[PDB]
């Protein structure tokens, strides 16, 4: 599950993913995160 700290981080994440970039790289590129669960925390609400 991906969680993002802000809307713009998420928007940048989704663009990063368009070419097929691994989520882990899109995460460090944006400040988004990968968690094993499905429940994003309040500070990664987007």
DSSP letter for each residue of the chain: -EE-SSHHHHHHHHHHHTTT--HHHHHHHHS-EE-SSS---GGG--
Could you give the C-alpha distances from 41 to 11, 15, 19, 20, 26, in angstroms and in order? 18, 23, 27, 26, 19
Topology at the third CATH level for domain 1-46: Crambin (3.30.1350)
**Nominal resolution (angstroms):** 1.0
Q: Could you tell me which residues come within 8 angstroms of residue 46 by beta carbon, excluding any fewer than 6 positions away?
A: 3, 4, 5, 6, 7, 9, 10
| Experimental approach taken | X-ray
């Amino acid at each position: 599950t991906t969680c993002c700290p802000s809307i713009v981080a998420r928007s940048n994440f989704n663009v990063c993913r368009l070419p097929g970039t691994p989520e882990a790289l899109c995460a460090t590129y944006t400040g988004c995160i990968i968690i094993p669960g499905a429940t994003c925390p309040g500070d990664y609400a987007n």
